[PDB]
């Protein structure tokens, strides 16, 4: 008889949990029916976007298992994710290869 | 021996939709948890403020959408807004 709010909404992300986290979080007295559906969709989208580009990066390094390095490359190689995570440290991510042109040898 | 919740199960489903042959390390998964929790707090946060600014008791789909417009850059917003409008559409049409 029971069908997860997630399965109704078309989502892998847990609509139920997101609703409870919005309650136990003192954001507002009350929580509209849709608010946790939307929020769960946004978190799933952004998770897809990052796992997409991380996947690509992982493949390129001849690899089938995403690691932090792959997350850091996907994010710091995307104008938009890089802005959204401009003030964020991905542990064990390193940095992008970047040598200032003037530091290259002459011949 | 008590329950320590995470988003791992969901991150792993979305991974398999997006890269069916691809795995993910324990450390990577820890980074994706931090991610979801962060964007959760940022969005809920701005929603809360929006609701408080308009003297409202209630955070609806609309406060979540405005929040997402304020917090996500250019094309990320536009795609997030449609994925979110879509999921709400699909849920409102479910007997």
């Amino acid at each position: 008889k029971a069908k997860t709010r997630s399965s109704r909404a078309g989502l892998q992300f847990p609509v139920g949990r997101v609703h409870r986290l919005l309650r136990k979080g003192n954001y507002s007295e009350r929580v509209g029916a849709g608010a946790p559906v939307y929020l769960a969709a946004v978190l799933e989208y952004l998770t897809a976007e990052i796992l997409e580009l991380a996947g690509n990066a992982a493949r390129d390094n001849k690899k089938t298992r995403i690691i932090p390095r792959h997350l850091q490359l996907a994010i710091r190689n995307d104008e938009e994710l890089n802005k959204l995570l401009g003030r964020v440290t991905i542990a064990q991510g390193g940095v992008l290869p970047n040598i200032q042109a003037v530091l290259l040898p002459k011949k | 021996r008590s329950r320590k919740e995470s988003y791992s199960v969901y991150v792993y489903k979305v991974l398999k939709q997006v890269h069916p042959d691809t795995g993910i390390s324990s450390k990577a998964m820890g980074i994706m948890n931090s991610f979801v929790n962060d964007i959760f707090e940022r969005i809920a946060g701005e929603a809360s403020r929006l609701a408080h600014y308009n003297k409202r008791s209630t955070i609806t789909s609309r406060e979540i959408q405005t929040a997402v417009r304020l917090l996500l850059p250019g094309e990320l917003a536009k795609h997030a807004v449609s994925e979110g409008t879509k999921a709400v559409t699909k849920y409102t049409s479910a007997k």
């Binding site: 799933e44 897809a48 | 939709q17 795609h79 994925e83």
Partner: peptide
């Protein structure tokens, strides 16, 4: 009909 990324790939079908 699931999630559509900026690249233009989708999340399979049903």
């Amino acid at each position: 009909p699931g999630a559509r990324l900026r690249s233009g790939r989708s999340t399979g079908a049903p």
